[PDB]
Design a protein around this ligand. Structure first.
Ligand SMILES: Cc1ncc(COP(=O)(O)O)c(CNc2cccc(C(=O)O)c2)c1O
Ligand SMILES: Cc1ncc(COP(=O)(O)O)c(CNc2cccc(C(=O)O)c2)c1O
Lengths: 384, 384
């Protein structure tokens, strides 16, 4: 029969006790308990960050980080055109213009040359996404950052526990955001965080204020200081996140061994090219096991996904080019046309139609199951 | 010694089992579990609504309801000047102009005449707040609504289980929003909901889409349809909300008996005037036990709060006039000056400085403790 992969999410007594501990504090919001506060320190420490701010979800961690980095009406935000819609939707929500840029053909990370060209006097932030756990070129990006003076924002939703040139997400000198959505590498069904490197304490304080209806942590008289929203995380969610956190490093360790095996097996299938590597990214979190089948239309790629699901695999189409979603064109759209953005985003334009991913739970399975998985793929790709 | 009041929040085995049940579904977001879905139906039914949409918090339920009711740049939203900042902050977040209007001197609900005067060609929504559980004049308001054609949005954060002219919040023909923040009448530490009356299915569908990154519930290929954000509630929070819901009606029943007693005891203190009633509001939820001490400056009212807390009471200053917060003036501010808004908001202007509230947990206590509470108040108000 079909191969079997470990469940996701996973839990055990840590989660069980955590939810009880949160419950029995008798206070369920961060102002009366200690679960969110403790999770923030544990999360930040794990990432080498000066501070962490746990929030309702990864899309709001992006909206908050952008907002304290000055994003707003009149500004532009550069984002990879290949990514989950939240990456641009967040800038759109703040009234800014999202400027989508091409990505690398092999890693699928934001392309540095492409961003250098898209820079403008309106650019307020450049947002690399560490695609499927593989960091983007933070050196090349950091250099464009200095030359232009446009700060970087890492969309680290796929990269919990990732490392670039030995450095943790939070030791790269830029703010970064995470997601704890159900399918993420650690999860409480929903959740997010904003992590602030050493030197960004002010933005951290402002972020706290904007995430709590502009209210000082100790205000009693409703002296709301600035605009914002409520993006507070509850204590129940925080306690489940603290148990997830504790298995993260080792889960990533099993995935790194398993991807080594799968990448090679896949790269052996004619027509099939697994996501590329980058040796400066010393610790790839392995959020997705991604591969292209260059030349496939969307419809053939979609049909192949369906055959893979039918054969017992947790396989998906990969992200749609963000300029090909209606959502993107509803507000803050760039003056270009759709073909004009596609013309300068040829890698996105193809990966949008030919890239497949399997759930990161496959990368926890045994070697036998990865062999069985790649046979299934090899057969199905013959018929695609 | 000081009187003692029942804890808040409260829980028992219902919460315990609920969190386990959520946990052991092994899927923690609404797309894989049934807790949010079930809570939505239970909540809607409880309110007589056609549909309910559970969301991250009450401030986002307001942002979502406004957004599907067309709020945006170029529009105005009328809100009571006396209320929690989220009521205006939500319109501000969508790029609209919040137009604060006066409230009744006795119930502290949005004043109908004051809204009639503030109506404009830009007005897109009028937002009554049911202050401390006491509904606003939904008849007078519904009439202004028809004459102008400006739809109403009920900010029902304080009014879970409330009734106007025998009708439930969701049977009033207008969308309404709730909060499940820690101090609310039912809570999971954080949470919110949008409830949609019969006839508003379209806005419900659009609301679902905007609350999930514009993604159709069944999309697999990232066809994001419209702008929005992520305001999805997690399964853990939903299961705690379903156990809270089940005690609500009876908790409100104990509060209604206790307020009858306290209102009278308080109204007997010279200088002291308890929130007024309204017999068309047949079921007052009793979110706060509120009273004015007309003529007190803020500083005396604040000092009296402190003495009440020192005497063992869970007493607070009441909301600040929203035109007196810096937050309000940061974005979407109305062209008027601060004194110009104060001049047409004389009740808010005074209640902002002279109104005190006690936590609704006091209204669960025994009669002896309410007597002890009103003695404490009577002494302290002598010295204020
Ligand atoms: C790159 C990236 N950035 C930000 C977000 C936002 O996170 P929240 O969901 O916590 O707001 C994400 C989320 N990623 C995500 C979320 C939901 C479904 C799927 C899917 O691939 O089917 C992917 C993401 O993948
Ligand atoms: C009238 C009203 N409207 C909307 C909100 C927003 O709900 P969330 O908090 O779920 O986003 C509220 C919240 N009310 C509230 C929340 C936090 C603290 C205090 C306090 O009085 O000290 C009051 C409120 O009281």
């Amino acid at each position: 029969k079909a191969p079997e992969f470990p469940a996701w999410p996973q839990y055990d007594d840590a989660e069980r006790n955590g939810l009880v501990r949160a419950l029995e504090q008798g206070q369920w919001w961060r102002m009366g308990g200690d679960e969110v506060n403790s999770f923030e320190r544990e999360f930040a420490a794990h990432h080498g960050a000066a501070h962490a701010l746990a929030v309702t979800n990864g899309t709001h961690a992006l909206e908050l980080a952008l907002q304290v980095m000055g994003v707003g009406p009149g500004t532009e935000v550069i984002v990879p055109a290949f990514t989950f819609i939240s990456s641009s939707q967040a800038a759109q929500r703040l009234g800014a213009v999202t400027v989508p840029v091409d990505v690398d053909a092999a890693t699928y990370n934001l392309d540095p040359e492409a961003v250098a060209a898209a820079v403008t006097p309106r650019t307020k932030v450049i947002m690399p996404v560490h695609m499927a756990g593989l960091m983007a070129d933070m050196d090349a990006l950091a250099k464009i950052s200095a030359d232009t003076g446009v700060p970087l924002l890492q969309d680290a939703a796929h990269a919990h526990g990732a490392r670039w040139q030995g450095k943790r997400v939070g030791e790269l000198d830029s703010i970064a955001t995470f997601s704890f959505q159900n399918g993420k590498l650690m999860t409480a069904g929903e959740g997010g965080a904003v992590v602030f490197p050493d030197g960004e304490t002010e933005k951290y304080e402002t972020a706290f204020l904007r995430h709590s209806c502009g209210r000082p942590r100790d205000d009693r008289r409703y002296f709301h200081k600035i605009a914002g929203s409520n993006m507070r995380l509850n204590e129940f969610s925080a306690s489940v996140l603290r148990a997830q956190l504790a298995r993260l490093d080792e889960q990533i360790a099993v995935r790194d061994e398993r991807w080594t095996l799968l990448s090679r097996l896949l790269g052996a299938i004619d027509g099939v090219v697994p996501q590329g590597g980058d040796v400066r990214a010393d610790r790839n979190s392995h959020y997705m096991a991604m591969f292209r089948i260059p030349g496939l239309t969307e419809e053939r790629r979609n049909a192949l996904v369906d055959r893979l699901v039918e054969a017992g695999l947790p396989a998906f189409a990969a992200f749609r080019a963000i300029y090909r979603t209606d959502a993107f064109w509803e507000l803050g759209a760039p003056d270009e046309s759709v073909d004009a953005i596609a013309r300068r985003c040829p890698n996105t334009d193809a990966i949008s139609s030919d890239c497949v991913w399997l759930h990161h739970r496959v990368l926890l399975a045994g070697e036998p199951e990865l062999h069985a998985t790649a046979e299934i793929i090899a057969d199905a790709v013959g018929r695609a």
